[model samples]
Target: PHSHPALTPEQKKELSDIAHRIVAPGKGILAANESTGSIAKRLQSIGTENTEENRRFYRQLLLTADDRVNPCIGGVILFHETLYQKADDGRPFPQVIKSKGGVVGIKVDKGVVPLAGTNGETTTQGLDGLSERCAQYKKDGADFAKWRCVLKIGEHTPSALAIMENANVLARYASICQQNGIVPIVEPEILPDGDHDLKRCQYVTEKVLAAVYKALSDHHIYLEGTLLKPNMVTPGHACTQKYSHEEIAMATVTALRRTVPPAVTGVTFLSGGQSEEEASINLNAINKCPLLKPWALTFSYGRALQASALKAWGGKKENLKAAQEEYVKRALANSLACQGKYTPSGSNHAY
Candidate 1:
């Protein structure tokens, strides 16, 4: 990978230091910000129409969540639109987050683009102009950036070419952001879009992350300055053979351990369309499992965190407080999971 001229040794050190502190033991990221397209897809499932105003309203509710967020969520990834949008009270979303002691992040990837020979798999695009965008977002109060590259399970899926290409793209993006003082959240998600067994999922995850970290090293990117947004190792949705939470936790941690370097700041698991309760429970189990994990194991959930709140809100003024409460409930639950303190009893509250 090519190098940029803006990054200095001192700047790199500072960003890496901040990334390390944020993911320090028991801390996790909050992925409250979803792109309009993603939000629209989510709303479609719930029979809600997508609109700009509705998107803004939903984000406002999440961003304005109370002090409970400060203790649980260390960073928040924002969509480009949300980063520039104002809260209902006229405050920038980033300011609202920072005021509550959360680092603000921007999604830098332009969404997925087709990978030439895969079975409908895709790689994230956005690197073409990422450097300038990162600089601008940093000025606008973004301390970090996120890019999601997705992989799927199928016969001959996630080919070596696919893994190498995506990993290199992620490393290049991370390098650019770190040079410009923005921490990059490198997410290479293996989609739960098949009926594969847990072992299959673990196999693919290990291979993908192994390629990712090696690319990061080859690119001379600073691992300490980056965060990983990844999918938890789990069986396919349609698989009749259900695995226990312990099994899922063991698989997830083992895959990560085999590939992820301990030097990376954090590993925030994506919900991958898991239900609110299921996501929380699985995360809690992962933390509780008697395994050796060298990094923070927590969440960066979007639909899982916001689904109930959006349902409650339904774009109604009367539901704003309820929505905020719902947001807080999930945040608190996941926070407890991050610390291995959550239990099934904790599901008593609405997620």
Candidate 2:
């Protein structure tokens, strides 16, 4: 057996419960933790200023989507500012989510750091004071935290050094989160920017996940205490060929089964630029794929969940209801998709 027990029984159970609840049944995550640098594009698209009030307004729409979001979102990832902000009714954002039975999460990473001597490879960095931050975040109503590391596929890209460095960084972050009673969502996202084939993406994903788990094991991370946010195996955006949903599903589950231990609680696949409908359909196929997937397979979506909502909102108070309904529609659609029961019809505009 390769696994060892590092956490006390109580600690193990706490992590396991939180991880399971986040992916329970038809529930998954709402990844609303876009950084200021990252959210400008989203705001610009809706002709909205990327100011704090607008950001808070947009986020509050999703968080306060009423009972429609209750059965769908088991957790909500929040930007640093949003977590500390309040709803219009004066309740804190975190309290509002908890009232709806959702776990509140914080994006703990400071963002990417460019790797020297590489072709634009980068790793996430934030561990300098993560332990203290996590403790404080937990006290402030966050039960889980997220840190993302980026990798790209190219001829000689994601070099051995880059892979090892990122894996270790994620391990460090996970270790600190666990120590501080916060479950960490480990995200090592391989970009979809290359012209790579599905097979090549699968190969790199398998290799990257293998390195990641080994680092986690070496760092004594409790696998059951964590969640994985990985890219589904798919051909790169610039590729010429098209793949059926089943093909992507096969590649994705095969890669996970090969490297991720059954001890891990769940796999929350990032949308990674797939169209919203395509993302939901593919996740449904993955759920139905004829493979023994031990971990819960679900989504941690940002654009896949918010593109329509953002467009509908248009930065106006009157548009909030339209935008909120869009989010609720996607949440309901994905809830069914995660359970292999989604039947796509004309359009989801009517919720």
Candidate 3:
């Protein structure tokens, strides 16, 4: 049978166009949207102060990453603070992103709150007045928005209630964004923070995603108007097991094929905790895997894309070019990786 209207044809098409452009072959996203507190940790790692100026300089370095990244980076996600921050020339950061042939996006989640009965599971908040925020963000030069919800894998972890609640919230967020002309990047990340094996992670991913899709269906979210930002299937950090990139690729693709719909515009993977090269290598393997994938399999990474750049910057204006170059290098590598053409010859992966 057929489903009736929850979205007008024009609305759906508008969103579909934006979503597709973001993952248009060989392109992905640069997720520079870390919140202030998060950015503080990144700065701490490099022994830099988290001053407003330093943050502005760091973001400017990334957003203005040379022309080489334009084709590779289709989008840039911004935190509210960075969204309004301006470039050195006084042009707004969002304006610079748009000029560089990339879409501007914003992160809208208000962080996570603990669930009452769960051991330590939490749900991402920020739905309060989200509708109004989307309206303003669209006018403020954002074409898309990202809201992330976290899930963990452990014994008595990611309880059914947590899965159902997070999925529904994500759907609700998606529905609102589309109504306001903003494409939503739905991020339901299952944390890689345990000793779970590959199959265990795969099992949890499949289960979490199945619930997410059903909730989106019930909410009548426009699938073609959205993107999925999920964790790639991998064993937990504390796991004692090891698997080749090919094995990880197989597990990842198999799970998505089982649950995600072809109507979804793309899948932009969160790096979770994978290192720069490791993330790129795994992405290449996933693309090369002998399986049919209908949506774009690309990346939406923050630390994975920026860690090297941050190190090179050293929070100094004198190192601006150095920082931008590192950022460009990763972008170029990941561009090839997304198309299954990456040949690792450097330290871009664990070597």
Candidate 4:
């Protein structure tokens, strides 16, 4: 039997309020925290030494850049290690973010573990002790949590086993988080990792999202208290076929309209390894697409937000100002994009 409990009038109102506040026009999240492993891979790609201190320095550069970030970035997602790390002044990183008027979030998934008997696919883990950890993090000033489940496209990609496993995990995590007053950023990312066309990506995304929402319903999770961090539907990276930004935008928005509930708080897109300018352009195009977008469409970009800044900083204090300026530029650009006001004129950044 489908269990639907009666909510008190006050509880229903509260949920509605949260949904409105988060999906409020012109506001979104910034995904600044890359895992140590991801950062290491990025460093290797650039021939830089990856160290704890270097990682801290890079994050510090971003967190303390300027106050301009407050407008577009409503919250910042942090890695577990970064949540407790201190600034050079010995202040907690979360405190630094709060002082700048931004909320702090933490990523809780252990990492993606391979699904048995699948075609190179995986599911997110870390559900065993998530409740207790979420309570502790809430006490430490975190108001939200993030978990990423990766899916791909292929002859038999995102098998039923993978879809159900990941959906159940995400629903369980979301239930626990809401019980602790921590909003969960439920991210089921379908990777653009094949030679497939755009329509294939859209078809897979719609199916996966349907499964996720149904699982969330089965778990009795409150959709109003959750945020969705999703990958924008696009063709595989290596695919020679090119799509216009308008085409990508139409496919993305239309898929979400079909599957995501109006009750979801917001949808912050992952840049999904697109170049910074490409990410911004795509986001801008998404907003410009002639469709009735129900939820806030913005970004939660890590590499798209930080690649140039990191390249400029080079792990040195002398480059701090330049790095901050770069950070501010991207933030401002994204802010405009979020409002659908981005004009690609003299700002040749969108290469």
Against the true structure, whose TM-score is highest?
3
Model 1 poorest 10 in a row by lDDT: 342-351
lDDT of 4 by residue, 302-346 (tens): 888888887787767798899878877887777777777777761
**Model 2: per-residue Cα lDDT over 1-351, one tens digit each:** 586555788987888898999999999899999988789999998788999988889999999997978888989999898999999999999999989989999999998989999988898889898899999999999999999999999999889989999999999999999988899999999999879999899999999999999999889999999999999999999999988898888888888988999999999989999888999999999998888999999889988999899999999999988999999999988888888888887211110
TM-score of each: 0.93, 0.96, 0.97, 0.92
How many residue pairs clash in each candidate at the backbone level? 0, 0, 2, 0
Q: For candidate 2, what is the lDDT?
A: 0.91
Q: What residue pairs are clashing in model 3?
A: 277-348, 277-349
Model 4, stretches more than 4 Å misplaced? 1-23, 45-48, 345-351
- Looking at model 2, the pairs that clash are none
Tens-digit lDDT string for candidate 3 (1-351): 588777788988889999998999999999999888989899998899999989999999999888999999999999999999999899999999999889999998899999999989999889889989999999999999999999999998789999999999999999889989999999999999999999999989999999999999999899999999999999999999998999899999999999999999999999988999999999999899888999999989888899899999998889999999999999998998888889886311211
| lDDT ranking from best candidate downward | 3, 2, 1, 4
lDDT for 324 (candidate 3): 91
lDDT of each: 0.83, 0.91, 0.92, 0.82
Highest-scoring model, lDDT? 3
lDDT of 3 at 339: 89
After superposing candidate 1, which stretches have Cα over 4 Å from the reference? 1-8, 24-26, 44-49, 347-351
Which parts of model 3 have CA positions greater than 4 angstroms off? 1-4, 346-351
